[PDB]
Amino acid sequence: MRECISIHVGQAGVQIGNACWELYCLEHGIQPDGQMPDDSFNTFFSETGAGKHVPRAVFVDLEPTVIDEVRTGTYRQLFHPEQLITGKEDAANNYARGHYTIGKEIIDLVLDRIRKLADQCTGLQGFLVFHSFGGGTGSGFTSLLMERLSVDYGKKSKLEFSIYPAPQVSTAVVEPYNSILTTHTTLEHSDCAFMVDNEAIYDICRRNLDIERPTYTNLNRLIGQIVSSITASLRFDGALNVDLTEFQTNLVPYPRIHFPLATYAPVISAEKAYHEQLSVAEITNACFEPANQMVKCDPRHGKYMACCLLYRGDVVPKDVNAAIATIKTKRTIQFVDWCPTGFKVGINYQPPTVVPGGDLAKVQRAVCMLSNTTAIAEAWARLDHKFDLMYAKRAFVHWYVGEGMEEGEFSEAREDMAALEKDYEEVGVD
Amino acid sequence: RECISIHVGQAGVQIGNACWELYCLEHGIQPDGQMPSDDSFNTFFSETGAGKHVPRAVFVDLEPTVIDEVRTGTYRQLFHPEQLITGKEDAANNYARGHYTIGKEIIDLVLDRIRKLADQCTGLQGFLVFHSFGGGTGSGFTSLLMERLSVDYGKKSKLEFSIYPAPQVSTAVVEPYNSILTTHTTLEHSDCAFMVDNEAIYDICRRNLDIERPTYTNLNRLIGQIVSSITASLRFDGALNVDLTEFQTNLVPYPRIHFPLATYAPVISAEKAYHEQLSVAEITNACFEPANQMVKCDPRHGKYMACCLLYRGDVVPKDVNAAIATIKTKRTIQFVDWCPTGFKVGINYQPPTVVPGGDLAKVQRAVCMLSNTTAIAEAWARLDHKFDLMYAKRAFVHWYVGEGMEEGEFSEAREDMAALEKDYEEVGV
Amino acid sequence: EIVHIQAGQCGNQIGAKFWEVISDEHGIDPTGSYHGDSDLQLERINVYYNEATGNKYVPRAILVDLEPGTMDSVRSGPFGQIFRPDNFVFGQSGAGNNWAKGHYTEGAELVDSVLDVVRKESESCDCLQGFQLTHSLGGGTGSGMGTLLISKIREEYPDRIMNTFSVMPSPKVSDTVVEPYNATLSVHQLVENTDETYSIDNEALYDICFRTLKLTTPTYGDLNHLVSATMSGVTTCLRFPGQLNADLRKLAVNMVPFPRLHFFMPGFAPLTSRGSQQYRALTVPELTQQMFDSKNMMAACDPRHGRYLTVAAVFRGRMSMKEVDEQMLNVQNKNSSYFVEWIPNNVKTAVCDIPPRGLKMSATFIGNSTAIQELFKRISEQFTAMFRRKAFLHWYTGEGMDEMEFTEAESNMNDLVSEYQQYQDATA
Amino acid sequence: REIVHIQAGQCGNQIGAKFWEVISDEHGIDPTGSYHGDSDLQLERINVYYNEATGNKYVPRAILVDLEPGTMDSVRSGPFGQIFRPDNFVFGQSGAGNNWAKGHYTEGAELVDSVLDVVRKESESCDCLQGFQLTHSLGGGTGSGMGTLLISKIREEYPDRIMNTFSVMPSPKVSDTVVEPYNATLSVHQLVENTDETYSIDNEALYDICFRTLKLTTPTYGDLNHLVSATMSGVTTCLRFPGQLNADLRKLAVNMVPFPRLHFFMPGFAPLTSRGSQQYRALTVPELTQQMFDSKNMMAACDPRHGRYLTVAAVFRGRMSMKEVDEQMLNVQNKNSSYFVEWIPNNVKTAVCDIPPRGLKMSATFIGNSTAIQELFKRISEQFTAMFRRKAFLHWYTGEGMDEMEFTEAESNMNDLVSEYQQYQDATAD
Amino acid sequence: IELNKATSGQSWEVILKPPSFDGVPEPSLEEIQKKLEAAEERRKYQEAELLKHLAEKREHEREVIQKAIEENNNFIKMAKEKLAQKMESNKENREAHLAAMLERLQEKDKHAEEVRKNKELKE
Numbered sequence A: 001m002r003e004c005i006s007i008h009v010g011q012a013g014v015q016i017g018n019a020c021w022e023l024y025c026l027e028h029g030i031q032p033d034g035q036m037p038d039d040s041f042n043t044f045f046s047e048t049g050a051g052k053h054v055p056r057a058v059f060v061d062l063e064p065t066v067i068d069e070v071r072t073g074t075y076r077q078l079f080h081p082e083q084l085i086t087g088k089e090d091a092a093n094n095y096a097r098g099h100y101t102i103g104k105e106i107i108d109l110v111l112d113r114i115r116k117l118a119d120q121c122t123g124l125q126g127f128l129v130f131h132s133f134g135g136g137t138g139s140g141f142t143s144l145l146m147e148r149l150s151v152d153y154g155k156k157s158k159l160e161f162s163i164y165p166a167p168q169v170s171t172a173v174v175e176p177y178n179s180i181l182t183t184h185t186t187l188e189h190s191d192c193a194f195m196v197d198n199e200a201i202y203d204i205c206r207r208n209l210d211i212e213r214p215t216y217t218n219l220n221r222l223i224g225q226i227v228s229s230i231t232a233s234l235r236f237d238g239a240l241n242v243d244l245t246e247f248q249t250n251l252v253p254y255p256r257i258h259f260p261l262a263t264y265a266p267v268i269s270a271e272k273a274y275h276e277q278l279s280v281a282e283i284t285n286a287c288f289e290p291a292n293q294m295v296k297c298d299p300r301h302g303k304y305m306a307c308c309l310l311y312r313g314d315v316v317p318k319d320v321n322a323a324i325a326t327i328k329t330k331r332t333i334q335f336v337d338w339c340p341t342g343f344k345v346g347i348n349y350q351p352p353t354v355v356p357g358g359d360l361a362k363v364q365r366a367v368c369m370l371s372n373t374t375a376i377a378e379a380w381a382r383l384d385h386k387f388d389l390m391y392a393k394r395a396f397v398h399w400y401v402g403e404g405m406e407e408g409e410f411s412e413a414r415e416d417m418a419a420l421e422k423d424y425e426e427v428g429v430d
Numbered sequence B: 001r002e003c004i005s006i007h008v009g010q011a012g013v014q015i016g017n018a019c020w021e022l023y024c025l026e027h028g029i030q031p032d033g034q035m036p037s038d039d040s041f042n043t044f045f046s047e048t049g050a051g052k053h054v055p056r057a058v059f060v061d062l063e064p065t066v067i068d069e070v071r072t073g074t075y076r077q078l079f080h081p082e083q084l085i086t087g088k089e090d091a092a093n094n095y096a097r098g099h100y101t102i103g104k105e106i107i108d109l110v111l112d113r114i115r116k117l118a119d120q121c122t123g124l125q126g127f128l129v130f131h132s133f134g135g136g137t138g139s140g141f142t143s144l145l146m147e148r149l150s151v152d153y154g155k156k157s158k159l160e161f162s163i164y165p166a167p168q169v170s171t172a173v174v175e176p177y178n179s180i181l182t183t184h185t186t187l188e189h190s191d192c193a194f195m196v197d198n199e200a201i202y203d204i205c206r207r208n209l210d211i212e213r214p215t216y217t218n219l220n221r222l223i224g225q226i227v228s229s230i231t232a233s234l235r236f237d238g239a240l241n242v243d244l245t246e247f248q249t250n251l252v253p254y255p256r257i258h259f260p261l262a263t264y265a266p267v268i269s270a271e272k273a274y275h276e277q278l279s280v281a282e283i284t285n286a287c288f289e290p291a292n293q294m295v296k297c298d299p300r301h302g303k304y305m306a307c308c309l310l311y312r313g314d315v316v317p318k319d320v321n322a323a324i325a326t327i328k329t330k331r332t333i334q335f336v337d338w339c340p341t342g343f344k345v346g347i348n349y350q351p352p353t354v355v356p357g358g359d360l361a362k363v364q365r366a367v368c369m370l371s372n373t374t375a376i377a378e379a380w381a382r383l384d385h386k387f388d389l390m391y392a393k394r395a396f397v398h399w400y401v402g403e404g405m406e407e408g409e410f411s412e413a414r415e416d417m418a419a420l421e422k423d424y425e426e427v428g429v
Numbered sequence C: 001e002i003v004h005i006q007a008g009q010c011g012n013q014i015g016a017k018f019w020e021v022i023s024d025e026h027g028i029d030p031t032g033s034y035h036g037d038s039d040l041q042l043e044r045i046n047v048y049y050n051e052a053t054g055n056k057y058v059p060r061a062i063l064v065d066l067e068p069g070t071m072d073s074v075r076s077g078p079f080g081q082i083f084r085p086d087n088f089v090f091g092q093s094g095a096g097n098n099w100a101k102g103h104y105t106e107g108a109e110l111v112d113s114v115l116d117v118v119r120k121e122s123e124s125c126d127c128l129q130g131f132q133l134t135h136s137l138g139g140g141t142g143s144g145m146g147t148l149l150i151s152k153i154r155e156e157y158p159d160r161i162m163n164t165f166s167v168m169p170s171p172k173v174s175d176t177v178v179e180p181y182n183a184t185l186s187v188h189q190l191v192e193n194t195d196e197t198y199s200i201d202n203e204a205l206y207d208i209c210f211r212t213l214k215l216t217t218p219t220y221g222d223l224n225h226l227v228s229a230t231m232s233g234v235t236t237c238l239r240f241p242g243q244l245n246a247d248l249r250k251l252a253v254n255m256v257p258f259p260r261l262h263f264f265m266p267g268f269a270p271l272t273s274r275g276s277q278q279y280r281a282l283t284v285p286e287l288t289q290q291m292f293d294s295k296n297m298m299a300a301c302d303p304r305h306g307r308y309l310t311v312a313a314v315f316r317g318r319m320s321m322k323e324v325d326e327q328m329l330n331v332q333n334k335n336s337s338y339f340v341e342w343i344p345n346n347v348k349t350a351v352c353d354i355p356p357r358g359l360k361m362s363a364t365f366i367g368n369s370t371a372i373q374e375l376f377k378r379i380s381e382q383f384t385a386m387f388r389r390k391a392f393l394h395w396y397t398g399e400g401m402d403e404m405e406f407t408e409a410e411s412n413m414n415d416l417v418s419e420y421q422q423y424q425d426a427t428a
Numbered sequence D: 001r002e003i004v005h006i007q008a009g010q011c012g013n014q015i016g017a018k019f020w021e022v023i024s025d026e027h028g029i030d031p032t033g034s035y036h037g038d039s040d041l042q043l044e045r046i047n048v049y050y051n052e053a054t055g056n057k058y059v060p061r062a063i064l065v066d067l068e069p070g071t072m073d074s075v076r077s078g079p080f081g082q083i084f085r086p087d088n089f090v091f092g093q094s095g096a097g098n099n100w101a102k103g104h105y106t107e108g109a110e111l112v113d114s115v116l117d118v119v120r121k122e123s124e125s126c127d128c129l130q131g132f133q134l135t136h137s138l139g140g141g142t143g144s145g146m147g148t149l150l151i152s153k154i155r156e157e158y159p160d161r162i163m164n165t166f167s168v169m170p171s172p173k174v175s176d177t178v179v180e181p182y183n184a185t186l187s188v189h190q191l192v193e194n195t196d197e198t199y200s201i202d203n204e205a206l207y208d209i210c211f212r213t214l215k216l217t218t219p220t221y222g223d224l225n226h227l228v229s230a231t232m233s234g235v236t237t238c239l240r241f242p243g244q245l246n247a248d249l250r251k252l253a254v255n256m257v258p259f260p261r262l263h264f265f266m267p268g269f270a271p272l273t274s275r276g277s278q279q280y281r282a283l284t285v286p287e288l289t290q291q292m293f294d295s296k297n298m299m300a301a302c303d304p305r306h307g308r309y310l311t312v313a314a315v316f317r318g319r320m321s322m323k324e325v326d327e328q329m330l331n332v333q334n335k336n337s338s339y340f341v342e343w344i345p346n347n348v349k350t351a352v353c354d355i356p357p358r359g360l361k362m363s364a365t366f367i368g369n370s371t372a373i374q375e376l377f378k379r380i381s382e383q384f385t386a387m388f389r390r391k392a393f394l395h396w397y398t399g400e401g402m403d404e405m406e407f408t409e410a411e412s413n414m415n416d417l418v419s420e421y422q423q424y425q426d427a428t429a430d
Numbered sequence E: 001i002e003l004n005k006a007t008s009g010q011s012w013e014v015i016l017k018p019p020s021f022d023g024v025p026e027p028s029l030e031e032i033q034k035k036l037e038a039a040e041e042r043r044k045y046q047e048a049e050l051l052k053h054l055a056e057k058r059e060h061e062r063e064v065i066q067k068a069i070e071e072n073n074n075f076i077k078m079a080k081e082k083l084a085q086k087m088e089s090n091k092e093n094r095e096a097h098l099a100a101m102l103e104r105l106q107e108k109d110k111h112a113e114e115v116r117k118n119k120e121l122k123e
C-alpha cells in the first residue's frame, strides 16, 4: 500500500540510486541479500514468499558499464536482473539520441518492466525519477520516459531528482542544451522536481566535509542523505510527523511553479572530534544560510511562496516553535502577500543513519528545508545564458539536427524557459 | 349527566394526573378501580362487570414518556389501555406541527376513543379539555380536536382548562406564537375557558407554601385543588353549577369574553405548628386579594360582569352573608351597567380533601371564587405584545410555514386577538 | 434516538473523546457494559447506545475516514473496543486535505458504503430525532465527505434533524495553505444542509490553551479536551433526565429564528486543564459571568461586537436554582444592549443535579449571536487572499471542479455575513 | 565499443605500424601477439583495438592497404609485423605514382572492393562497432587518393558510425614532390565531408620539431614518426585506458566539433623526446601545462596565438597531483582567456591517466580546435594556386581521365574552409 | 334572595346594587378538512421542491466527477498524439538526412565512372 516505484536514468541517475539504495537498506535493517531481522517501508520494498525484500525500483541506461557495476556489485542480489535494463550504445551526450535514435529501441522494454513492478502495487502513489540534466540519456531518455508514463499512468504523481550541471563537477560543453531541452519536454509531465546543483554538493564537501577533490561517491552519498530525508515521510510512519504530498500542496501554488529548493543541515566531517551535538535552532538557522542550499541561488533577495521543515532524529516541537519564532521576527524572510507566513513542519523519529566507512559523521538531529522561493529561477537564468551563447552561433546544433531534431525545438524549449522565468517574475509581484 | 375529561399534551396530562388523583380521594376510589361502603360521582366514572369505576377520561400526547409515567404508577389499573393514546414524537414546541403535521395522523384514533367513551352515555353534558397554551401538542392538537368535537358531538358544552405560560415556569421562546394561534382556533369552539397563569401558581407555592423553587408536582397539587373546587358541584349532589351549561349562564354573558378569573382560599402549608383554623369572613376577604388569584391581572381596575363563590366543607350560610355585607361596607367594587351588582353563592358540604403526605394541609373550610372581570384583557395584552415583537421581524415563523400553515394565519390570529381586546374596551366602559 | 457519524482525522478524534467522556458519565466501561452507580444513568441511555444482549451497550456511531490511519488509532485506543466493527467505514486513498477529493472523486466511492451502515443503524430505533456529525472544515474527509454525507442524508431523511460539531480552521493551528478553500466550500453546504451547527474555532481553542490554561505548547489532546467538555455539556439535556424533557428539534425551533442563521457559539466554564488539578469550589456569579465572557467561547468572535438572538445555558451540579436565576437576570439587566429586544425572554437556563467528571459544578453556553459573522469574514478574507491570484486552485480544478463553484461558495458566505448584519442593526 | 583501423599507403602503413608497436607494448602484448603484462587495466579496454583470437592471443583490428608491395613487405618483416592477420594485408602492384587520381579513381578503385571485403569481415566480429580510424599521407597516391576513396566507400556502408583520421600534411621541408599540394588539396575536400574528426599532423611542424628543438641536423622519417606515435598513444589514451570517463569516439566528436566542416584538430605533445633517447628527469605539472599550449610543441605548424580556440581537450598521463593539474589549467585559460571563445562556455576539458607512456614518468597530450589551423590550409592553397595558376604537372591527373574543373572546385572548397575558419575567429558574443 | 337547596350542597343569589341599564346588548367537517388537506399539500410541495434541489446537486456531482475523468482522457489523448507526431517527424527527418547523404555519395560515385570512361576516351 501507498506504493512508490523509483526510476534511475543514465550514469548520474543510477549512481545516485545506488547511494540512495544502500542507505535505505541501512535505515530499515536490510542486508545486501534482501533478508531483514513499522510495516511502512514496504512502500519502497516488495517482499517474496522466501522473506527477501526487493526495492520497487528500475535502473535504466543506454550502455552497460554503469549498470554492470551493480550487477557484479556488493548488492548484485538486492535486485532482479529483469529490473536492471542496459543498452549497448550510449546517447553520446545527445538529447536527440536519448529521446529518439537510441532510446526508442529500449523504451518499450523499460515501460514493460515498470508495468510489472506496477502490477504488484495495491495502491501506487506514483514515480521517483533520478536523472542528470547533462547526459544524453539523463536528458533525452528521461523526457521520453516521463512523456510515456503520462500516457501509460495518466495523471499519476511523477517526481524528479535532477542534477544541475557544474563545471567543477565534470560536465560537457553541450550540457546547457540537454538541460534546457529536458526541462521543456518534461515540464507538463512533472508534478514536482528536486533540483540538485552539483556545485553546491561540491562546495559542501569542500567546506564542511573538507574534500579538496570530491569523488562522485562523496557527492552521491551526500545527495542520498538529502533524498532519504525528503522520502523519510514515506518509508517511515511516526505519530511525531513525517508527511510528504501535504508538503507538495504548499510547495506547488500553480502547476509550473513546482521546483522546491532544499537546504540540508548538518553536514559534519567524520573527524570534527568534540562536536557532539547541536541544538534544534542551530540546525533550523543553518537552513537560512545559502552555504547549505542544494541549488546555488539568493532567496534573501527574492520572495517566498512556501517553507517546509523536515526534522529527524531527536526533535521536540517545544524547541522547533521556539526556533521558528526567533526566525519569523527577522525581516529577510519575505513571503508574497497572496500566501501565509507559516512554515509547514514534519518530524521523524529514526535518526539519520550514516554509511559505514563514510565521510559524514553520526548526527543526533538533521533537518531539510523545502521551500518555494522565486530565487530558484536564477538557476534557470544561469543555464539559459550558456544556451543563448552557443545557440546564437548554433554551436553543436548540427549533432541534434543530424539525429532528427529541428532548430524549432530549441526555440520552442527556449521560449518555454523564458515564459518560466516570466512566471517566476509575475508570481513574486505583490 | 356524564362528563369526558380530555388531557392534551405534557401539561394537561400531568395536571389531569393530579385531578383524578384528587377525585379518587374525595369519592373514596382505590387506584385499582374499586371503592368501599351521594352517588353523583358517576358523572366521571363508568363501572365494569367486575365492580371497578373507570374514570371517563382520555389522555393524549404525541410522545410516549408522560403517559408511561401513568401506565406505571399506582393508578395504572384505573384506566384501560384504549383511553391512554401516545404517539412516537411530540410537536417540537410547534403549533403548526401539532395541528397540521402530527395532528392529521392521530385525530380519528383520539375521536374514536371519545366515541366509544360517548357510546356509554345516557346523555353527554359536554367535555373538559386540559392542556397548556405554549406547547406544540397542548395547542396544535387541542385546537384541531376542539374543532372536531364541535362537529362530531356538536351543541355539547366545553370547559377549557389552560395553563397560561410564565418565564419563572419552564417557558419556551415560541410560546406566544402557539398561545395566540391556539386562542384564535379555540375561540368559536369554547363555551367557557379557565386560564391558570403559571406565575400566579408559582408565587402561591412560595409566599404561602414556603417552597422557593417549586416542582411541577407542587404547582399541580394547587391547580387540582381549584379544578376539583370547580367540579365540586358536578361530582357531588350540589345546587350551584350542577351542570356544565351552568358556567355559560352563571359567568359567560358575551360569548367571546369567556375567560373567568379564579380565586382560592386558604393556601395552607403542613410544615408549620397548628393554630385556630380560619372562619368564613377570614377566607371570604381572601377571595378579593390579588395574592390568591389564579391569574396575574388587576381586578381593582376593570369592570366585572359576573361573580360566584364556591364553598367547601364546614361552612354556614349566615356566616357567608355576614361576610358579603362587610365587603360592600368599605369597598364599592365596580361592575358593568348592563349587569346586576351581585354574587351567586353556592355551598357544597363535602370536606376539602388534601393529598395524604403532601405540601397542602388538612382544612375544614375552603372557598374557590369564579368571577368574570374586564381585567383579564391585561393578561392577553402581555402575550399580544410578545407575539408582536417576534412577528414584527418574523422570528421563528419559518418553522410554522415549514409545517404547512400560512404566514396569513399569523396576522389572522393576532387581528382576531386585537378584536377580542377591543371587546373588553366596548364592555369595559 | 440519535445516530452519530464522525468523519476524518479531526472528526473521529473529537468524536472518540465525546464517546469516552459520556461513557464515564453513563457507567459504560471500555468493554461495553453498565457498571454505573444510579439507574438515572440508564434512564436515557437509549439515545446514544444500543443493546447487544449482552447486556452489552454499543455506541450508535459510524466511523468514517478516506484513509485507515485514524480509525486504527481508535481501534488500538482505550475506549475503542466499544464500537461495532461493522461500523468502521474507511478507504485507502486518503482525500489528502482536499475538499474536492473528499466531497467529489474519493468520497463518492466510499459514500454509499457508509450510507448503507446508517440505513441499518436507523432500523434499530423506535423513533429517531436526527443525526450528529463531528468533523473539521479544513481537511478533505470531514470537510468534503462530511458535507456530502449531510447532503445524501438530507436526501434520505428530509424530516430528520441535522446537528454538527464543525471545527473551524485557523492559520495559527495547522499550516496547510488550502484550508480557507475547504472551509468556505464546507460552510456554503452547512448554511443549507444543517439545522444546528456548533461553531468550534481552533483559533479560540489554541488561545484558551495558550493564554488562559498557561499551556506553553498546546497539543491536539488539549484542544480536544475543551471540545469534549462542551460536547457533553451541550448534550446534557438529551441524555440526562431533568425537568427538561426536551430534544434536538425543540432546541432548533427555539434557537434558530431564521433558517440560515443557525451557527452557535459554544462556551464552557470552568476551563479545566488536562489531568491537573481541580480543588476549590466556584461561586454562582463566578460560574455565570465567566461563561458570558469571551475568554470562555470556543468561537473566535467578540460577542460584544454583535447582539444575541437566542441563548441556551445548562448549569451542572448542586447549586441554588435561586442564585443561578438571580445571576442570569442580573447579567441580562446589565448587558441589555447586546441581547435582541424583539425576542422576549431569549436567554434560557437549564440545570442538572449530577455534576461532570472531576469538576463539581460546570456551565455550558450556546449563543446564537450576530457576532459570528466575524468568524466568516476572517475565513472569507483568507479565501480571497489566495483567490484573487487563483493560488492553489489547480488542486481542485484537477478534481473536476470549476472556478464558478469557488465564486458561489464565497458569494453564498458573503451573503451570510450581510444576513447577520441586518438583525445586528435591527431594534423593536 | 570496438574500433576498426585502416592504414593506407607508404605513410599510412609507416605511421600505423609504429602506432601498433607503441600501443601493443602499452597493453602487455608481445610481437607474437601473446599477453604478459602485470596490470588487469591493460586488458580492461583491449577489445577496442584487438580481436581476442584462439589460444588466448590478441590480434589488431587493422587492415593494411597499399597499391605497391614495398612498405607492405617491410611491415610484414617488421619487429611486430607477424602480429597482424596476413589476410588483412590488402595490397596491389601497380603503384599510385604519388598521384591522387591513380589512387582515388584508377589503380585504387580496382583494389577498393577487395578492401571492403576485409573491412566487412572485421566489422562482423564486433559486439558494437564504434567507428573507423584511418592513417594516411595527404601527399601521396594511395594515402591521399585511395584512402579518401575508402572513406567515401566505408561512409556509404556505415553512415551511423564515426570516421576518425590521422592525416599527415605535406611540407617542402620534407618532400620535393612538386604535385604534393594538388593531392593535399583534393584530400582535404574529401576529409571535410567524409570524416567526423581529423588530427592534422603537419610534416612542416614535425621536421621543425626534430630540427630546431631536438637538434637533429638531418632528421629522418623515423625521427618524425616517433612524434606521431607519441601523439597517437596520447589522443587514443582515454579510449584504451580505464578512467573517469566513458570513453567514446562519438562523445568526443559531439563535444569537440561545434560546426560540421570544422573538425581538423591541432595535436600537441609534451615532453618532446628524441627517438630512442633515455629520459633525463620528469617535467613538473606547470611545465606540462605550459609546454602543451606552446606553438613550439604543436603537431601542426600554426600559431595558436594567431587564432581562437573553439574547443580544447587535454590528457595528462602519469601519477601526478590533479589539484596542481587543475590549478594550472585554469590559470592558463584565465590569462590567455582572449584565445578562447566566449560563445562556447567552458570549452577546455581535462583527463588524467595514471598509466604513463613508455619511458616517460609524465606526459601531456593536447587536442585543440583552433581557428589558427586556417594557416595550414592557406599554406597548402598558396602552393596549390601557384602550380595550378601555371597548369603545372596537370597531365599526370588528366591522364587518369580527370578534369581541370575538379581542381578549380577543390581550390574554392579549400578557400571556403579558410573563410569559414576566419568567420568564427573574428565572431564576437556582444 | 334564594337560588336552590340541595343534598351535600346549596345555592342563593345575592343582589347588592341593581343593573343601571335594562336591555342587555349594545362550522363544518368538509371546510376543516378542505383547510387541513390544503396545508398538507403546501408541506408536501416544499418537500418536493427541496427534493428537486438535491437532485440537481446530485446531478452536479455526476458532471464534476465526469469532467475529472474527461480531463484525463484528453490529457492521455494529447500526450499520446503529441508523441505520435514527434516520433514520426524525427523518423522521416533523420532518414531523409541519411537518404540525402547517400545520394550525394552515389552522386560522387557517378563522377568516378565518367573519369574511368574519360581515361578510355583519352586512350
Ligand SMILES: CC[C@H](C)[C@@H]([C@@H](CC(=O)N1CCC[C@H]1[C@H](OC)[C@@H](C)C(=O)N[C@@H](Cc1ccccc1)c1nccs1)OC)N(C)C(=O)[C@@H](NC(=O)C(C)(C)N)C(C)C
Residues within 6 Å of the ligand: A239, A240, A317, A318, A320, A321, A324, A342, A343, A344, A345, C009, C013, C073, C172, C173, C174, C175, C217, C218, C219, C220, C221, C222
Ligand atoms: C498549532 C497546531 C500544531 C499542529 C501543534 C501541535 C499538534 C499536536 O499536538 N499533534 C499533532 C500530532 C498529534 C498531536 C500530539 O503529538 C503526538 C499529541 C500530544 C496528541 O494530542 N495526539 C492525539 C490526541 C491525544 C490526546 C491525548 C493523549 C494522546 C493523544 C491525536 N492523534 C491524532 C490526531 S490528534 O504540536 C504540539 N503545534 C503547537 C506545533 O508546534 C506544530 N507547529 C505549528 O503548527 C507551527 C510552528 C505554527 N507551524 C508542530 C511543530 C508540532
Ligand SMILES: Nc1nc2c(ncn2[C@@H]2O[C@H](COP(=O)(O)OP(=O)(O)OP(=O)(O)O)[C@@H](O)[C@H]2O)c(=O)[nH]1
Residues within 6 Å of the ligand: A009, A010, A011, A012, A013, A015, A016, A061, A062, A063, A066, A090, A091, A092, A093, A132, A133, A134, A135, A136, A137, A138, A139, A163, A164, A165, A166, A169, A170, A171, A172, A175, A198, A216, A219, A220, D246
Ligand atoms: N552527482 C553526480 N553527478 C553525476 C554523476 N554522473 C554524472 N554526473 C553528472 O551528470 C552529467 C553527465 O551525465 P551522465 O549521467 O554521466 O550521462 P548519461 O548520458 O545519462 O549516461 P552515460 O551515457 O552512461 O554516460 C554531468 O553534469 C555530471 O556532472 C554521479 O554519479 N553523481
Ligand SMILES: Nc1nc2c(ncn2[C@@H]2O[C@H](COP(=O)(O)OP(=O)(O)OP(=O)(O)O)[C@@H](O)[C@H]2O)c(=O)[nH]1
Residues within 6 Å of the ligand: B008, B009, B010, B011, B012, B014, B015, B061, B062, B063, B090, B091, B092, B093, B132, B133, B134, B135, B136, B137, B138, B139, B163, B164, B165, B166, B169, B170, B171, B172, B198, B216, B219, B220
Ligand atoms: N403547571 C404545569 N405546567 C406545565 C406542566 N408541563 C408543562 N407545563 C407548561 O406547559 C408549557 C409547555 O407545554 P407542554 O405541555 O409541556 O408541551 P407539549 O407540546 O404540549 O407536550 P410535549 O411536546 O410532549 O412536551 C410551559 O409553559 C410549561 O411550563 C405541568 O406538569 N404543570
Ligand SMILES: COc1cc2c(c(OC)c1OC)-c1ccc(OC)c(=O)cc1[C@@H](NC(C)=O)CC2
Residues within 6 Å of the ligand: B170, B171, B172, B173, B174, C234, C237, C238, C244, C246, C247, C248, C250, C251, C252, C254, C255, C310, C311, C312, C313, C314, C346, C347, C348, C349, C350
Ligand atoms: C436538548 O437540550 C435543550 C433543548 C431545548 C433548550 C435547551 O436549552 C435550555 C436545551 O439544552 C441545550 C431550549 C433552548 C432555547 C430557548 O430559547 C432560546 C428556549 O426557550 C427553550 C429551550 C427548551 N425549553 C425549556 C422550557 O427549557 C426546549 C429546547
Ligand SMILES: Nc1nc2c(ncn2[C@@H]2O[C@H](COP(=O)(O)OP(=O)(O)O)[C@@H](O)[C@H]2O)c(=O)[nH]1
Residues within 6 Å of the ligand: C007, C008, C009, C010, C011, C013, C014, C095, C096, C097, C098, C102, C136, C137, C138, C139, C140, C141, C142, C143, C167, C168, C169, C170, C173, C174, C179, C202, C205, C220, C221, C223, C224
Ligand atoms: N481541534 C482539533 N482540530 C484538529 C484535530 N485534528 C486535526 N485538526 C484540524 O483539522 C483540520 C484538517 O482536517 P483533518 O481532520 O486533519 O483532515 P480530514 O481527514 O481530511 O478531515 C486542520 O485545521 C487541523 O487543525 C483534532 O484532534 N482537534
Ligand SMILES: Nc1nc2c(ncn2[C@@H]2O[C@H](COP(=O)(O)OP(=O)(O)O)[C@@H](O)[C@H]2O)c(=O)[nH]1
Residues within 6 Å of the ligand: D008, D009, D010, D011, D012, D014, D015, D096, D097, D098, D099, D137, D138, D139, D140, D141, D142, D143, D144, D168, D169, D170, D171, D174, D175, D180, D203, D206, D221, D224, D225, D228
Ligand atoms: N611523417 C611521415 N611522412 C611520410 C612518411 N612517408 C611518406 N611521408 C609523407 O607523405 C607524403 C608522400 O606520401 P606517401 O605515403 O609516400 O604516398 P602513397 O604511399 O602513394 O600514399 C610526403 O608529403 C611525405 O612527407 C612517413 O613514414 N612518415
Ligand SMILES: [Mg+2]
Residues within 6 Å of the ligand: A090, A091, A092, A093, A094, A135, A136, A137, A138
Ligand atoms: Mg550519454
Ligand SMILES: [Mg+2]
Residues within 6 Å of the ligand: B090, B091, B092, B093, B094, B135, B136, B137, B138
Ligand atoms: Mg410539543
